[PDB]
Amino acid sequence: DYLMKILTERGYSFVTTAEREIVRDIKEKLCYVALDFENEMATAASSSSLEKSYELPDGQVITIGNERFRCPETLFQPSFIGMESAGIHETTYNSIMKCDIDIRKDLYANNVMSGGTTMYPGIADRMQKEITALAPSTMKIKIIAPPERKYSVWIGGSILASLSTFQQMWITKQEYDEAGPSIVHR
Amino acid sequence: DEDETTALVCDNGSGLVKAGFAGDDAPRAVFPSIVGRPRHQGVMVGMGQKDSYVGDEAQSKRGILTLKYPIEHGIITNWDDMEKIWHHTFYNELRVAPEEHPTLLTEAPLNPKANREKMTQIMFETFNVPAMYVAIQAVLSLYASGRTTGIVLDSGDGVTHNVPIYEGYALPHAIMRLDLAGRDLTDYLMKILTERGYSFVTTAEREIVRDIKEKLCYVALDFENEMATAASSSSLEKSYELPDGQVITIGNERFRCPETLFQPSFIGMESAGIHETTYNSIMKCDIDIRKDLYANNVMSGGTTMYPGIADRMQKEITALAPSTMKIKIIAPPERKYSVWIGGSILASLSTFQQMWITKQEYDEAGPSIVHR
Amino acid sequence: DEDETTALVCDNGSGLVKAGFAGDDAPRAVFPSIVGRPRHQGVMVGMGQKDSYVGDEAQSKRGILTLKYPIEHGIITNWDDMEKIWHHTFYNELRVAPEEHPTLLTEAPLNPKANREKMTQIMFETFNVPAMYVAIQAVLSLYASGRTTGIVLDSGDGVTHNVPIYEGYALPHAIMRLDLAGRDLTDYLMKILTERGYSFVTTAEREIVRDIKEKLCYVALDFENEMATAASSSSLEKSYELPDGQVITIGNERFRCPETLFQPSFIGMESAGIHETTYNSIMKCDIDIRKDLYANNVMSGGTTMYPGIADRMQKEITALAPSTMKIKIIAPPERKYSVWIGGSILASLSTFQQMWITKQEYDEAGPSIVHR
Amino acid sequence: DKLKEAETRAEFAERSVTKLEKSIDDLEDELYAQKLKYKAISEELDHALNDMTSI
Amino acid sequence: DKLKEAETRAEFAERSVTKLEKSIDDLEDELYAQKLKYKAISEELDHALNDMTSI
């Protein structure tokens, strides 16, 4: 919805519902998370062959040069959208300085990313550098972002549930009819 | 060989166990004297439910267990948890079966008669060792430095002691115990280092203050004009790099921590300090033996390893002792294992065989037999 | 009168400043300990450009400023921003000129020597007060309850402390600090109340969770069979009406919030809790003084105001203390200002005049003079 | 005499340890640089093998 | 006395040098293993990026 506005704001109109829906397909296909989002706006201005035109349901070739990355810069700067909360990288970090001390080297070398919105290319490099520069230099940072990440959650379930050892954690109707919903609740 | 190879030496401490085979030069096994009990039900991946944890697995997993120390101030306080540490020592650490190995154990200076009988009851009746023997710790330290008369200042993790020994017999009425040791000392550094403007916040910050104490701490001689030196600010300072980059600097406090051993007043202790106590032990002994004790102050224990401890003690007791006297502070390099090494020597010895308490002695005389 | 009227008492906290004239019964000025710095350039209608905001104007305008807290856990962490809060206190809140008023200030329990010297440097050298004095907070709380020996459990917005005091001297080595207080406590209520199925979404929802905590929260004795009671669902429930109609109900959580002070485990804290800590302070003190401390547990601080705090503490330490002992938990009604009132008394006192540090003492002895 | 010998040799052993410790930190650092420069090309890879199996 | 100290520390400095020399050889060897395990995935890569630009 933020891309929507920076793209109407680029001088456009997503007027019919066939215009609305495809802004989301623009976000998925053409959006980027640039590292050094600073001198990427600066780059935008010199106007390189950074621009990118998408052809709509019909001919209406829309161009998106710059906004292309202004959309995922929202994940590091919530201020782009009137959010006062902290952003993704700071939050990674704050989670970490809320944990036990002895476990913080582990968490830092194992930042696993999952979810559809973490798929924006260069998300991992920006996060890599975002937390290196907040973490004590004695630390090893490591941002794992696998390719199938839009289904990590599911795949982890597929593995686990097809596993040889999981059989003994399944809550059966025997457990339930005998223990009430409490049984699976743990 | 039957038992030349076969004698075990287990030194039970307040912080660490030291263990291994009589014959070796140093302990095969060194590990914390803890027994962890899980606060919640659950498992590690691939393991079963564990009722208990001992040594380093208890330390490493401390966040989900309630940790307990079986030996308070050198004395065994919980016998259920001690039999657990012994079990771990034989079966997992040294991986031996105990029922075919003679076992030399150690006890503390004025260890209650009843305890020496109880660990004998557990050695012979629940571990079924062939034979065993309990040596007093200061006595093994002395002996490992070759001699038989001297006074040992022994200092580890929970206790400090002075045990005057004459031709092998530790002198009961002259022994002094000071309950301030390396454990107390790590916690005081902790505060003078947070007080230097720092934070040992996570458990990976806590643990390493102890590794700062061991690596960088000093016992300065003329601790007076060492503070004075600190102020002119020489290249006396010392920065340590933490688990990460966070380079912490310790200049001065570096020696303010072992000055606690001479001044217990640094920590709200009203007791006298190490050097005075060495001395008081000595003016509590027979008169004719006091020149001997003075020329044979043997030091042992992890907390007596702070460099320049010996020079400070040297000058501390010269200046309290009558000038007609010869002072001599022996501090060997292997001193964090003196006790153990003295046991290794003794138990591998050719003449010790006839002092081993055998199951024959026990099944026939009751725990009284080894108690002496 | 010269200074009978004229002595100021400023108690600097982690959340609130309490200020006023020695002589008064309660603080003339109470306000947040913040300093706001505008995130953007612009003005309010009729005012000029303001570089900074302090107290309530910083809270009210928080959406356009970056708020900062000068006192972290009772210790002054930013001296540029603290001199700003003092300036505001004298000139705007109390509207006095400081250069003709003696100023009694307070510091925290183990406040670094260097800080007590720095706020003296700023009091005398940038505010030019005639004379000043720094009292330790627990010590003023005790004294305001008439006595001179007791142990204060002091708990405000960022820190909790136990300060055992004997004939006026706070006992350094027995003091305990627990970094969980009313601030931590409002944020935990927040979650157990959103977790009750709610949303404190706008900033007018956030702020009032704190007013729920103050008005409706309880410390139940037998917190065990109070949860059990919750379930049978008695008329224990309590609905509060929000800025608008939106009547929110809080039955149970009402006491789950102060049970955090006895169980830090409710919030992922591994530290011990208030009552155990009262006790541990006490078994760290001299033996002969422990009956005194036990019959004089004085409570002070905003977070010790939760009703039934005293009864729970009463029974919490009776059942840890040897039965030969008399337990006595004093919790006065004005306790959210004990500290301040103790300063008002002391500084208006007839005998205190001879302890004021004057500019004569300072210009002649350096900051060292007041440091003691 | 035993002394001048024990001390001089201690100094040489310490000079050699600081040399080897300096070479271990350069290889261990050249390292997390290599080990990481990869997670990036092997991950750019599961990705750049998945889109052509899809296209 | 200066002696027991100089010798005991010489021994500790030598034990630490042999420890660090042992850790440098393991990291330097774990290394040519990493540096090589890659030429293979980076080369499998120019390849596995070229065929989808072609299809």
JSON list of N, CA and C in Angstrom, two decimals, chain B residues 80-120:
[
{"chain": "B", "resi": 80, "resn": "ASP", "atom": "N", "xyz": [24.52, -36.92, 48.84]},
{"chain": "B", "resi": 80, "resn": "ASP", "atom": "CA", "xyz": [23.78, -37.45, 47.67]},
{"chain": "B", "resi": 80, "resn": "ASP", "atom": "C", "xyz": [24.41, -36.89, 46.41]},
{"chain": "B", "resi": 81, "resn": "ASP", "atom": "N", "xyz": [24.55, -35.57, 46.40]},
{"chain": "B", "resi": 81, "resn": "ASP", "atom": "CA", "xyz": [25.29, -34.88, 45.36]},
{"chain": "B", "resi": 81, "resn": "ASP", "atom": "C", "xyz": [26.77, -35.13, 45.29]},
{"chain": "B", "resi": 82, "resn": "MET", "atom": "N", "xyz": [27.48, -35.58, 46.32]},
{"chain": "B", "resi": 82, "resn": "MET", "atom": "CA", "xyz": [28.90, -35.87, 46.21]},
{"chain": "B", "resi": 82, "resn": "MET", "atom": "C", "xyz": [29.03, -37.21, 45.53]},
{"chain": "B", "resi": 83, "resn": "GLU", "atom": "N", "xyz": [28.27, -38.23, 45.92]},
{"chain": "B", "resi": 83, "resn": "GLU", "atom": "CA", "xyz": [28.33, -39.55, 45.30]},
{"chain": "B", "resi": 83, "resn": "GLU", "atom": "C", "xyz": [28.06, -39.43, 43.81]},
{"chain": "B", "resi": 84, "resn": "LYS", "atom": "N", "xyz": [27.23, -38.44, 43.44]},
{"chain": "B", "resi": 84, "resn": "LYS", "atom": "CA", "xyz": [27.05, -38.08, 42.03]},
{"chain": "B", "resi": 84, "resn": "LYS", "atom": "C", "xyz": [28.36, -37.57, 41.42]},
{"chain": "B", "resi": 85, "resn": "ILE", "atom": "N", "xyz": [29.10, -36.61, 42.01]},
{"chain": "B", "resi": 85, "resn": "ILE", "atom": "CA", "xyz": [30.37, -36.17, 41.43]},
{"chain": "B", "resi": 85, "resn": "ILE", "atom": "C", "xyz": [31.38, -37.30, 41.36]},
{"chain": "B", "resi": 86, "resn": "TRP", "atom": "N", "xyz": [31.47, -38.19, 42.35]},
{"chain": "B", "resi": 86, "resn": "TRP", "atom": "CA", "xyz": [32.41, -39.31, 42.29]},
{"chain": "B", "resi": 86, "resn": "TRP", "atom": "C", "xyz": [32.07, -40.22, 41.15]},
{"chain": "B", "resi": 87, "resn": "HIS", "atom": "N", "xyz": [30.77, -40.55, 41.03]},
{"chain": "B", "resi": 87, "resn": "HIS", "atom": "CA", "xyz": [30.31, -41.43, 39.97]},
{"chain": "B", "resi": 87, "resn": "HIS", "atom": "C", "xyz": [30.77, -40.91, 38.60]},
{"chain": "B", "resi": 88, "resn": "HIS", "atom": "N", "xyz": [30.50, -39.62, 38.38]},
{"chain": "B", "resi": 88, "resn": "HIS", "atom": "CA", "xyz": [30.93, -38.95, 37.18]},
{"chain": "B", "resi": 88, "resn": "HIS", "atom": "C", "xyz": [32.43, -39.06, 37.01]},
{"chain": "B", "resi": 89, "resn": "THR", "atom": "N", "xyz": [33.22, -38.92, 38.06]},
{"chain": "B", "resi": 89, "resn": "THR", "atom": "CA", "xyz": [34.66, -38.95, 37.93]},
{"chain": "B", "resi": 89, "resn": "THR", "atom": "C", "xyz": [35.15, -40.28, 37.49]},
{"chain": "B", "resi": 90, "resn": "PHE", "atom": "N", "xyz": [34.71, -41.35, 38.13]},
{"chain": "B", "resi": 90, "resn": "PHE", "atom": "CA", "xyz": [35.17, -42.65, 37.73]},
{"chain": "B", "resi": 90, "resn": "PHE", "atom": "C", "xyz": [34.66, -43.02, 36.36]},
{"chain": "B", "resi": 91, "resn": "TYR", "atom": "N", "xyz": [33.34, -43.01, 36.20]},
{"chain": "B", "resi": 91, "resn": "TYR", "atom": "CA", "xyz": [32.79, -43.58, 35.01]},
{"chain": "B", "resi": 91, "resn": "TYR", "atom": "C", "xyz": [32.83, -42.81, 33.77]},
{"chain": "B", "resi": 92, "resn": "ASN", "atom": "N", "xyz": [32.79, -41.50, 33.85]},
{"chain": "B", "resi": 92, "resn": "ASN", "atom": "CA", "xyz": [32.77, -40.70, 32.63]},
{"chain": "B", "resi": 92, "resn": "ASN", "atom": "C", "xyz": [34.09, -40.00, 32.41]},
{"chain": "B", "resi": 93, "resn": "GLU", "atom": "N", "xyz": [34.62, -39.33, 33.42]},
{"chain": "B", "resi": 93, "resn": "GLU", "atom": "CA", "xyz": [35.85, -38.62, 33.25]},
{"chain": "B", "resi": 93, "resn": "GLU", "atom": "C", "xyz": [37.04, -39.55, 33.08]},
{"chain": "B", "resi": 94, "resn": "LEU", "atom": "N", "xyz": [37.30, -40.49, 34.01]},
{"chain": "B", "resi": 94, "resn": "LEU", "atom": "CA", "xyz": [38.47, -41.34, 33.89]},
{"chain": "B", "resi": 94, "resn": "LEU", "atom": "C", "xyz": [38.11, -42.64, 33.17]},
{"chain": "B", "resi": 95, "resn": "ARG", "atom": "N", "xyz": [36.80, -42.90, 33.00]},
{"chain": "B", "resi": 95, "resn": "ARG", "atom": "CA", "xyz": [36.22, -44.04, 32.30]},
{"chain": "B", "resi": 95, "resn": "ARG", "atom": "C", "xyz": [36.69, -45.42, 32.79]},
{"chain": "B", "resi": 96, "resn": "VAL", "atom": "N", "xyz": [37.07, -45.45, 34.06]},
{"chain": "B", "resi": 96, "resn": "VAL", "atom": "CA", "xyz": [37.56, -46.68, 34.67]},
{"chain": "B", "resi": 96, "resn": "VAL", "atom": "C", "xyz": [36.41, -47.34, 35.40]},
{"chain": "B", "resi": 97, "resn": "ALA", "atom": "N", "xyz": [36.53, -48.64, 35.70]},
{"chain": "B", "resi": 97, "resn": "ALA", "atom": "CA", "xyz": [35.57, -49.26, 36.59]},
{"chain": "B", "resi": 97, "resn": "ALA", "atom": "C", "xyz": [36.24, -49.11, 37.95]},
{"chain": "B", "resi": 98, "resn": "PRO", "atom": "N", "xyz": [35.64, -48.56, 39.01]},
{"chain": "B", "resi": 98, "resn": "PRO", "atom": "CA", "xyz": [36.27, -48.39, 40.31]},
{"chain": "B", "resi": 98, "resn": "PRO", "atom": "C", "xyz": [36.60, -49.66, 41.08]},
{"chain": "B", "resi": 99, "resn": "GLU", "atom": "N", "xyz": [35.82, -50.75, 40.87]},
{"chain": "B", "resi": 99, "resn": "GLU", "atom": "CA", "xyz": [36.04, -51.98, 41.62]},
{"chain": "B", "resi": 99, "resn": "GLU", "atom": "C", "xyz": [37.30, -52.76, 41.36]},
{"chain": "B", "resi": 100, "resn": "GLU", "atom": "N", "xyz": [38.17, -52.25, 40.49]},
{"chain": "B", "resi": 100, "resn": "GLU", "atom": "CA", "xyz": [39.50, -52.82, 40.44]},
{"chain": "B", "resi": 100, "resn": "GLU", "atom": "C", "xyz": [40.58, -51.75, 40.58]},
{"chain": "B", "resi": 101, "resn": "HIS", "atom": "N", "xyz": [40.30, -50.55, 41.14]},
{"chain": "B", "resi": 101, "resn": "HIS", "atom": "CA", "xyz": [41.33, -49.54, 41.30]},
{"chain": "B", "resi": 101, "resn": "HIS", "atom": "C", "xyz": [41.51, -49.03, 42.70]},
{"chain": "B", "resi": 102, "resn": "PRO", "atom": "N", "xyz": [42.66, -48.98, 43.35]},
{"chain": "B", "resi": 102, "resn": "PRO", "atom": "CA", "xyz": [42.80, -48.43, 44.69]},
{"chain": "B", "resi": 102, "resn": "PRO", "atom": "C", "xyz": [42.57, -46.94, 44.48]},
{"chain": "B", "resi": 103, "resn": "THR", "atom": "N", "xyz": [41.91, -46.23, 45.41]},
{"chain": "B", "resi": 103, "resn": "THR", "atom": "CA", "xyz": [41.55, -44.82, 45.27]},
{"chain": "B", "resi": 103, "resn": "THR", "atom": "C", "xyz": [42.12, -43.94, 46.39]},
{"chain": "B", "resi": 104, "resn": "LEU", "atom": "N", "xyz": [43.05, -42.98, 46.15]},
{"chain": "B", "resi": 104, "resn": "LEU", "atom": "CA", "xyz": [43.52, -42.09, 47.19]},
{"chain": "B", "resi": 104, "resn": "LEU", "atom": "C", "xyz": [42.70, -40.86, 47.04]},
{"chain": "B", "resi": 105, "resn": "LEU", "atom": "N", "xyz": [42.04, -40.52, 48.14]},
{"chain": "B", "resi": 105, "resn": "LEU", "atom": "CA", "xyz": [41.20, -39.34, 48.22]},
{"chain": "B", "resi": 105, "resn": "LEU", "atom": "C", "xyz": [41.79, -38.26, 49.09]},
{"chain": "B", "resi": 106, "resn": "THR", "atom": "N", "xyz": [41.29, -37.03, 49.04]},
{"chain": "B", "resi": 106, "resn": "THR", "atom": "CA", "xyz": [41.80, -36.06, 49.96]},
{"chain": "B", "resi": 106, "resn": "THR", "atom": "C", "xyz": [40.69, -35.48, 50.81]},
{"chain": "B", "resi": 107, "resn": "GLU", "atom": "N", "xyz": [41.03, -35.04, 52.01]},
{"chain": "B", "resi": 107, "resn": "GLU", "atom": "CA", "xyz": [40.07, -34.31, 52.83]},
{"chain": "B", "resi": 107, "resn": "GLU", "atom": "C", "xyz": [40.70, -33.00, 53.30]},
{"chain": "B", "resi": 108, "resn": "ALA", "atom": "N", "xyz": [39.88, -32.17, 53.92]},
{"chain": "B", "resi": 108, "resn": "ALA", "atom": "CA", "xyz": [40.31, -30.90, 54.43]},
{"chain": "B", "resi": 108, "resn": "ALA", "atom": "C", "xyz": [40.94, -30.95, 55.81]},
{"chain": "B", "resi": 109, "resn": "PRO", "atom": "N", "xyz": [41.67, -29.91, 56.17]},
{"chain": "B", "resi": 109, "resn": "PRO", "atom": "CA", "xyz": [42.31, -29.77, 57.45]},
{"chain": "B", "resi": 109, "resn": "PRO", "atom": "C", "xyz": [41.64, -30.23, 58.73]},
{"chain": "B", "resi": 110, "resn": "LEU", "atom": "N", "xyz": [40.46, -29.81, 59.16]},
{"chain": "B", "resi": 110, "resn": "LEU", "atom": "CA", "xyz": [39.96, -30.32, 60.43]},
{"chain": "B", "resi": 110, "resn": "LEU", "atom": "C", "xyz": [38.65, -31.01, 60.09]},
{"chain": "B", "resi": 111, "resn": "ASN", "atom": "N", "xyz": [38.69, -31.86, 59.06]},
{"chain": "B", "resi": 111, "resn": "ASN", "atom": "CA", "xyz": [37.55, -32.60, 58.53]},
{"chain": "B", "resi": 111, "resn": "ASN", "atom": "C", "xyz": [37.03, -33.46, 59.66]},
{"chain": "B", "resi": 112, "resn": "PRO", "atom": "N", "xyz": [35.76, -33.31, 59.98]},
{"chain": "B", "resi": 112, "resn": "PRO", "atom": "CA", "xyz": [35.10, -34.07, 61.03]},
{"chain": "B", "resi": 112, "resn": "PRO", "atom": "C", "xyz": [35.25, -35.57, 60.89]},
{"chain": "B", "resi": 113, "resn": "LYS", "atom": "N", "xyz": [35.67, -36.23, 61.97]},
{"chain": "B", "resi": 113, "resn": "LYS", "atom": "CA", "xyz": [35.92, -37.68, 62.03]},
{"chain": "B", "resi": 113, "resn": "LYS", "atom": "C", "xyz": [34.90, -38.56, 61.31]},
{"chain": "B", "resi": 114, "resn": "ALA", "atom": "N", "xyz": [33.66, -38.10, 61.48]},
{"chain": "B", "resi": 114, "resn": "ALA", "atom": "CA", "xyz": [32.48, -38.73, 60.96]},
{"chain": "B", "resi": 114, "resn": "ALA", "atom": "C", "xyz": [32.35, -38.72, 59.45]},
{"chain": "B", "resi": 115, "resn": "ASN", "atom": "N", "xyz": [32.89, -37.68, 58.79]},
{"chain": "B", "resi": 115, "resn": "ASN", "atom": "CA", "xyz": [32.93, -37.53, 57.35]},
{"chain": "B", "resi": 115, "resn": "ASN", "atom": "C", "xyz": [33.92, -38.49, 56.75]},
{"chain": "B", "resi": 116, "resn": "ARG", "atom": "N", "xyz": [35.13, -38.60, 57.37]},
{"chain": "B", "resi": 116, "resn": "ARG", "atom": "CA", "xyz": [36.22, -39.46, 56.87]},
{"chain": "B", "resi": 116, "resn": "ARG", "atom": "C", "xyz": [35.68, -40.87, 56.95]},
{"chain": "B", "resi": 117, "resn": "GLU", "atom": "N", "xyz": [34.96, -41.22, 58.02]},
{"chain": "B", "resi": 117, "resn": "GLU", "atom": "CA", "xyz": [34.24, -42.49, 58.06]},
{"chain": "B", "resi": 117, "resn": "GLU", "atom": "C", "xyz": [33.10, -42.58, 57.02]},
{"chain": "B", "resi": 118, "resn": "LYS", "atom": "N", "xyz": [32.37, -41.51, 56.70]},
{"chain": "B", "resi": 118, "resn": "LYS", "atom": "CA", "xyz": [31.28, -41.60, 55.74]},
{"chain": "B", "resi": 118, "resn": "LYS", "atom": "C", "xyz": [31.77, -41.78, 54.32]},
{"chain": "B", "resi": 119, "resn": "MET", "atom": "N", "xyz": [32.76, -41.04, 53.83]},
{"chain": "B", "resi": 119, "resn": "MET", "atom": "CA", "xyz": [33.26, -41.26, 52.49]},
{"chain": "B", "resi": 119, "resn": "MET", "atom": "C", "xyz": [33.96, -42.60, 52.33]},
{"chain": "B", "resi": 120, "resn": "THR", "atom": "N", "xyz": [34.31, -43.22, 53.44]},
{"chain": "B", "resi": 120, "resn": "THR", "atom": "CA", "xyz": [34.90, -44.53, 53.40]},
{"chain": "B", "resi": 120, "resn": "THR", "atom": "C", "xyz": [33.77, -45.52, 53.24]}
]
